[PDB]
Amino acid sequence: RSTTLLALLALVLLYLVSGALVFRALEQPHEQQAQRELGEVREKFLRAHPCVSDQELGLLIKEVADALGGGADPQSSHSAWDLGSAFFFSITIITTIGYGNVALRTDAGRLFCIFYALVGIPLFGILLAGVGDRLGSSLRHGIGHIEAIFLKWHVPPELVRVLSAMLFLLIGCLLFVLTPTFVFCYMEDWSKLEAIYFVIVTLTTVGFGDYVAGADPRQDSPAYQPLVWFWILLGLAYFASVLTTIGNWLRV
Amino acid sequence: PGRAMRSTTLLALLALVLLYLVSGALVFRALEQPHEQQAQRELGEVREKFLRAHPCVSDQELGLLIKEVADALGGGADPEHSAWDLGSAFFFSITIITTIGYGNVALRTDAGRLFCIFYALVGIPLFGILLAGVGDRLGSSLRHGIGHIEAIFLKWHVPPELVRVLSAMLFLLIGCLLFVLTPTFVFCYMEDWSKLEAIYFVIVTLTTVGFGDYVAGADPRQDSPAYQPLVWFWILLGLAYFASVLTTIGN
Ligand SMILES: [K+]
Ligand SMILES: [K+]
Numbered sequence: 001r002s003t004t005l006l007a008l009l010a011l012v013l014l015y016l017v018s019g020a021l022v023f024r025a026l027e028q029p030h031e032q033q034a035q036r037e038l039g040e041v042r043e044k045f046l047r048a049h050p051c052v053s054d055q056e057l058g059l060l061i062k063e064v065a066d067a068l069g070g071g072a073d074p075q076s077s078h079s080a081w082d083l084g085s086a087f088f089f090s091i092t093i094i095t096t097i098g099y100g101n102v103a104l105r106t107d108a109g110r111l112f113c114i115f116y117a118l119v120g121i122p123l124f125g126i127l128l129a130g131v132g133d134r135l136g137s138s139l140r141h142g143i144g145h146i147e148a149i150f151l152k153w154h155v156p157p158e159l160v161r162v163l164s165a166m167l168f169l170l171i172g173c174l175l176f177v178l179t180p181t182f183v184f185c186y187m188e189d190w191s192k193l194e195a196i197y198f199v200i201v202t203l204t205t206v207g208f209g210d211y212v213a214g215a216d217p218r219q220d221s222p223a224y225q226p227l228v229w230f231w232i233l234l235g236l237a238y239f240a241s242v243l244t245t246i247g248n249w250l251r252v
Numbered sequence: 253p254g255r256a257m258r259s260t261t262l263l264a265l266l267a268l269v270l271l272y273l274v275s276g277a278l279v280f281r282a283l284e285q286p287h288e289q290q291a292q293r294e295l296g297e298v299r300e301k302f303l304r305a306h307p308c309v310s311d312q313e314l315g316l317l318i319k320e321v322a323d324a325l326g327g328g329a330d331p332e333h334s335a336w337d338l339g340s341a342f343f344f345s346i347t348i349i350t351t352i353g354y355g356n357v358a359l360r361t362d363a364g365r366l367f368c369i370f371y372a373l374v375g376i377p378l379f380g381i382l383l384a385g386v387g388d389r390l391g392s393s394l395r396h397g398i399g400h401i402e403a404i405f406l407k408w409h410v411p412p413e414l415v416r417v418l419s420a421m422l423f424l425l426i427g428c429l430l431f432v433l434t435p436t437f438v439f440c441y442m443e444d445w446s447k448l449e450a451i452y453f454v455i456v457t458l459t460t461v462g463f464g465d466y467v468a469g470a471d472p473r474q475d476s477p478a479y480q481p482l483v484w485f486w487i488l489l490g491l492a493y494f495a496s497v498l499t500t501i502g503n
């Protein structure tokens with residue numbers, strides 16, 4: 001369809017512009033303030049210390065950031081490539097989340113990562129779609145036990161459908177969105193919004209990598225990080241099905 | 253047209269994926285553990301690199317400097333070009349709907365993070381439908397293509413049935429040339445990346461993994477005509493091509 005295609009494309013283009021302009025209005029003043037803040041501290045350390053060069057001060061500013069990206073001294077002797085984070089990094093590939101919090105450096109690892117991605121993602125894509133309704137229909141199966149008693153006095157079976165369909169969406173969005181946010185606030189000390197901001201960026205596989213729920217499982221997290229990707233696997237599989245079940249319902 | 257099949261096939265795949273993620277991790281371990289992180293012991297040794305080269309600065313003064321710049325870098329400081337100009341903000345929007353999400357430029361405003369959530373919840377399905385539109389219209393290009401596969405291609409010692417599997421190889425290749433090999437040769441000469449690093453970028457970009465370690469649109473010089481516009485066009489058309497080919501192969 002020549003008309004329907006361009007009607008959406010132009011709608012997307014205007015949507016891309018409008019999103020950027022709102023993003024510009026929300027982030028530009030915070031950036032300008034931070035740069036002038038760096039502009040102020042740059043002066044006083046050059047003022048108080050004439051022996052320090054204007055460049056030598058800047059080389060430090062780089063070496064502080066350019067080295068510790070990516071590490072901080074405001075993470076006790078943890079390795080960036082232990083069996084856990086490597087297992088995390090592998091999952092970020094096939095899930096296409098790709099946090100990028102840990103960066104590849106070896107060229108040999110980059111080549112293997114390419115072929116790891118080309119084979120892995122379709123392999124996970126089947127499993128994710130596989131478990132999707134495999135878990136989904138298994139959970140809509142349990143809905144039926146309710147619908148039995150939920151069908152007596154003045155109860156229409158036609159409405160029993162929607163009183164379990166939205167409920168299936170409810171407790172699923174409850175178990176896989178509200179619950180992890182309530183957990184991540186009490187495990188990673190993120191704010192109530194920062195947890196929702198993480199889960200949404202995680203489940204949408206945008207994977208900004210600014211927030212990561214599995215940097216390092218303390219020293220007594222019994223299965224926290226294992227529970228993290230377990231939340232990712234079942235969380236993606238569930239919400240992928242929700243994004244498609246609503247996709248066929250939207251075919252109007 | 254859906255197979256349940258998972259009563260026994262799922263566990264065969266799930267356990268395969270588990271062993272695949274493990275094998276991928278243990279190989280990733282040996283490939284990156286020797287180089288490892290740059291954390292901690294880099295700030296600590298550049299700290300003493302400063303104390304020795306500059307006597308007039310006390311340890312207490314330098315310590316505050318690091319926290320003063322860390323608070324600055326935690327807002328959008330750039331060591332020696334805005335990070336949220338109309339170009340990069342447009343770039344940042346695309347990274348959302350395309351689910352690539354480099355994260356090279358991070359959200360810091362709490363108000364921006366909320367708006368981004370709804371922008372993702374709505375934007376991705378919107379781009380998701382449009383991407384299908386450049387697969388259905390490309391389907392007409394394929395219907396026009398099936399006329400080509402019957403003629404010429406099977407006249408040699410080449411079977412007509414495998415011609416379907418061999419003529420599509422050319423349609424795959426010329427697109428794999430136009431959207432994979434072509435940008436890599438460009439990015440090596442525009443972003444000065446090595447011959448491998450460009451391929452590392454393209455594959456990660458198109459697969460929407462988006463590690464963000466490499467970005468072919470940080471800032472388009474000052475004389476680049478439409479380089480950055482060419483970049484999302486490479487993505488928007490690049491995502492569209494593989495979207496069609498992977499649905500076309502969906503026989
Ligand atoms: K995807
Ligand atoms: K990403």
Ligand SMILES: [K+]
Nearest residue numbers: 096205351460
């Ligand atoms: K993705």
Ligand SMILES: [K+]
Nearest residue numbers: 069325356358
């Ligand atoms: K940063």
Ligand SMILES: [K+]
Nearest residue numbers: 097206352461
């Ligand atoms: K991603």
Ligand SMILES: [K+]
Nearest residue numbers: 099100354463
């Ligand atoms: K990322």
